[PDB]
Amino acid sequence: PLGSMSQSNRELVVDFLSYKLSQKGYSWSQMAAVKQALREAGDEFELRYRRAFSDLLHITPGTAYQSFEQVVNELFRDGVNWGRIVAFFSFGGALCVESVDKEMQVLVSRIAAWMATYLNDHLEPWIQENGGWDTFVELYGN
Amino acid sequence: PEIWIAQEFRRIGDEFNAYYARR
Ligand SMILES: [Zn+2]
Protein backbone atom coordinates (compact mmCIF):
# COMPACT_ATOMS: atom_id res chain seq x y z
CA PRO A 1 0.00 0.00 0.00
CA LEU A 2 1.10 3.57 -0.71
CA GLY A 3 1.93 6.04 2.06
CA SER A 4 2.15 9.83 2.12
CA MET A 5 3.48 11.66 -0.95
CA SER A 6 4.78 14.22 1.54
CA GLN A 7 6.47 11.64 3.78
CA SER A 8 8.09 10.42 0.59
CA ASN A 9 9.26 13.93 -0.32
CA ARG A 10 10.45 14.60 3.22
CA GLU A 11 12.41 11.34 3.43
CA LEU A 12 14.66 12.28 0.52
CA VAL A 13 15.16 15.86 1.70
CA VAL A 14 16.16 14.45 5.08
CA ASP A 15 18.54 11.97 3.43
CA PHE A 16 20.38 14.49 1.24
CA LEU A 17 20.84 16.83 4.23
CA SER A 18 22.40 14.27 6.59
CA TYR A 19 24.99 13.35 3.99
CA LYS A 20 26.06 16.97 3.66
CA LEU A 21 26.25 17.35 7.43
CA SER A 22 28.21 14.10 7.83
CA GLN A 23 30.72 15.45 5.32
CA LYS A 24 31.02 18.73 7.25
CA GLY A 25 31.42 16.92 10.56
CA TYR A 26 27.80 16.77 11.66
CA SER A 27 25.02 14.22 11.87
CA TRP A 28 21.24 14.36 11.64
CA SER A 29 20.81 11.62 14.25
CA GLN A 30 22.67 8.82 16.03
CA MET A 31 21.10 6.64 13.38
CA ALA A 32 22.52 8.81 10.58
CA ALA A 33 26.03 8.89 12.05
CA VAL A 34 26.05 5.14 12.64
CA LYS A 35 24.90 4.34 9.10
CA GLN A 36 27.78 6.20 7.50
CA ALA A 37 30.29 4.69 9.90
CA LEU A 38 29.13 1.19 8.95
CA ARG A 39 29.07 2.00 5.25
CA GLU A 40 32.75 3.00 5.50
CA ALA A 41 33.87 0.24 7.84
CA GLY A 42 32.26 -2.01 5.25
CA ASP A 43 34.14 -0.68 2.23
CA GLU A 44 37.29 -0.78 4.35
CA PHE A 45 36.47 -4.41 5.10
CA GLU A 46 35.77 -5.12 1.42
CA LEU A 47 39.13 -3.61 0.46
CA ARG A 48 41.23 -5.42 3.06
CA TYR A 49 39.72 -8.82 2.30
CA ARG A 50 38.40 -8.96 -1.28
CA ARG A 51 40.01 -12.38 -1.66
CA ALA A 52 37.51 -14.08 0.65
CA PHE A 53 34.29 -12.97 -1.09
CA SER A 54 34.65 -15.15 -4.19
CA ASP A 55 31.85 -17.40 -5.48
CA LEU A 56 30.33 -18.30 -2.11
CA LEU A 57 28.35 -22.25 -2.78
CA HIS A 58 25.09 -23.60 -4.21
CA ILE A 59 23.13 -20.38 -3.73
CA THR A 60 19.48 -21.19 -4.40
CA PRO A 61 16.31 -19.78 -2.85
CA GLY A 62 15.76 -23.36 -1.68
CA THR A 63 18.28 -23.89 1.14
CA ALA A 64 19.08 -20.16 1.30
CA TYR A 65 18.02 -19.33 4.85
CA GLN A 66 19.16 -22.74 6.10
CA SER A 67 22.66 -22.20 4.72
CA PHE A 68 22.45 -18.65 6.09
CA GLU A 69 21.31 -19.17 9.68
CA GLN A 70 24.23 -21.58 10.02
CA VAL A 71 27.10 -19.42 8.75
CA VAL A 72 26.03 -16.66 11.12
CA ASN A 73 25.60 -19.02 14.07
CA GLU A 74 29.13 -20.18 13.29
CA LEU A 75 30.41 -16.62 12.83
CA PHE A 76 29.56 -15.61 16.39
CA ARG A 77 29.99 -19.20 17.62
CA ASP A 78 32.33 -18.13 20.43
CA GLY A 79 31.44 -14.48 20.94
CA VAL A 80 30.65 -11.15 19.39
CA ASN A 81 32.92 -8.16 18.81
CA TRP A 82 32.90 -5.04 16.65
CA GLY A 83 34.84 -6.74 13.84
CA ARG A 84 32.53 -9.75 13.58
CA ILE A 85 29.49 -7.48 13.47
CA VAL A 86 31.13 -5.80 10.47
CA ALA A 87 32.02 -9.27 9.16
CA PHE A 88 28.33 -10.03 9.69
CA PHE A 89 27.03 -7.04 7.68
CA SER A 90 29.44 -7.23 4.76
CA PHE A 91 28.37 -10.88 4.49
CA GLY A 92 24.75 -10.00 3.81
CA GLY A 93 25.76 -7.46 1.16
CA ALA A 94 27.47 -9.98 -1.11
CA LEU A 95 24.62 -12.45 -0.75
CA CYS A 96 22.38 -9.68 -2.03
CA VAL A 97 24.82 -8.79 -4.81
CA GLU A 98 25.45 -12.41 -5.84
CA SER A 99 21.71 -13.10 -5.64
CA VAL A 100 20.60 -10.43 -8.11
CA ASP A 101 23.34 -11.96 -10.27
CA LYS A 102 20.88 -14.79 -10.84
CA GLU A 103 17.70 -12.70 -10.97
CA MET A 104 17.13 -14.25 -7.53
CA GLN A 105 16.39 -10.64 -6.59
CA VAL A 106 13.44 -12.06 -4.64
CA LEU A 107 16.01 -13.39 -2.16
CA VAL A 108 17.14 -9.88 -1.27
CA SER A 109 14.02 -8.79 0.64
CA ARG A 110 14.13 -11.99 2.69
CA ILE A 111 17.85 -11.64 3.46
CA ALA A 112 17.39 -8.19 5.02
CA ALA A 113 14.84 -9.55 7.35
CA TRP A 114 16.98 -12.43 8.55
CA MET A 115 19.69 -9.94 9.60
CA ALA A 116 17.35 -7.41 11.19
CA THR A 117 15.76 -10.04 13.40
CA TYR A 118 19.09 -11.73 14.12
CA LEU A 119 20.80 -8.45 14.95
CA ASN A 120 17.74 -7.67 17.05
CA ASP A 121 17.53 -10.95 18.93
CA HIS A 122 21.24 -11.86 19.10
CA LEU A 123 23.60 -9.04 18.12
CA GLU A 124 21.52 -6.35 19.83
CA PRO A 125 22.31 -7.65 23.34
CA TRP A 126 26.12 -7.69 23.07
CA ILE A 127 26.19 -4.30 21.33
CA GLN A 128 24.27 -2.83 24.26
CA GLU A 129 26.46 -3.81 27.22
CA ASN A 130 29.56 -3.05 25.17
CA GLY A 131 29.14 0.73 25.17
CA GLY A 132 26.33 1.05 22.64
CA TRP A 133 26.60 2.12 19.01
CA ASP A 134 28.12 5.44 20.04
CA THR A 135 31.11 3.36 21.14
CA PHE A 136 31.41 1.68 17.75
CA VAL A 137 31.31 5.03 15.96
CA GLU A 138 34.38 6.12 17.91
CA LEU A 139 36.39 2.95 17.21
CA TYR A 140 35.38 2.74 13.56
CA GLY A 141 34.62 6.31 12.39
CA ASN A 142 36.97 7.78 9.75
CA PRO B 1 31.54 -26.72 2.47
CA GLU B 2 30.17 -23.62 4.25
CA ILE B 3 31.58 -24.10 7.78
CA TRP B 4 35.06 -23.26 6.49
CA ILE B 5 33.73 -19.89 5.23
CA ALA B 6 32.05 -18.97 8.51
CA GLN B 7 35.40 -19.73 10.12
CA GLU B 8 37.12 -17.49 7.57
CA PHE B 9 34.79 -14.59 8.31
CA ARG B 10 35.45 -15.09 12.00
CA ARG B 11 39.18 -14.71 11.25
CA ILE B 12 39.51 -11.70 8.94
CA GLY B 13 36.79 -10.07 11.03
CA ASP B 14 39.14 -10.47 13.98
CA GLU B 15 42.15 -9.03 12.21
CA PHE B 16 39.81 -6.13 11.56
CA ASN B 17 38.52 -5.89 15.13
CA ALA B 18 42.14 -6.04 16.27
CA TYR B 19 42.95 -3.08 14.03
CA TYR B 20 40.43 -0.59 15.36
CA ALA B 21 40.81 -2.01 18.86
CA ARG B 22 44.54 -1.18 18.85
CA ARG B 23 43.76 2.38 17.73
ZN1 LIG C 1 2.97 -2.00 -3.02
User: Of B3, B23, B2, B20, whose CA–CA distance to A84 is shortest?
Assistant: B20
Task: Specify whether domain A1-142 bears CATH 1.10.437.10.
Answer: yes
> What residues of chain A, 4 to 43, have a C-beta less than 8 Å from chain B?
none
How many beta-carbon contacts under 8 Å exist across A and B? 71
CA distance B13 to A80: 10
CA distance A53 to A23: 29
CA distance A29 to A25: 12
CA distance A87 to A41: 10
For chain A, say whether B4 makes contact (Cβ under 8 Å). Answer: no
Q: What is the 3-state secondary structure (H, E, C) of chain B?
A: CCHHHHHHHHHHHHHHHHHHHHC
CA distance A35 to A31: 6
Is residue A66 within 8 A of residue A23, CB to CB? The reply is: no
Point out the residue among A71, A77, A83 whose CB comes nearest to the CB of B2.
A71
Is residue A41 within 8 A of residue A140, CB to CB? The reply is: yes
DSSP codes joined into one string, chain A: ----HHHHHHHHHHHHHHHHHHHTT--S-HHHHHHHHHHHHHHHHHHHTGGGGTT-----SSSHHHHHHHHHHHHTTT---HHHHHHHHHHHHHHHHHHHTTTTTHHHHHHHHHHHHHIIIIIHHHHHHTT-HHHHHHHH--
Is residue A87 within 8 A of residue B12, CB to CB? The reply is: yes
Experimental method: X-ray
CA distance A93 to A8: 25
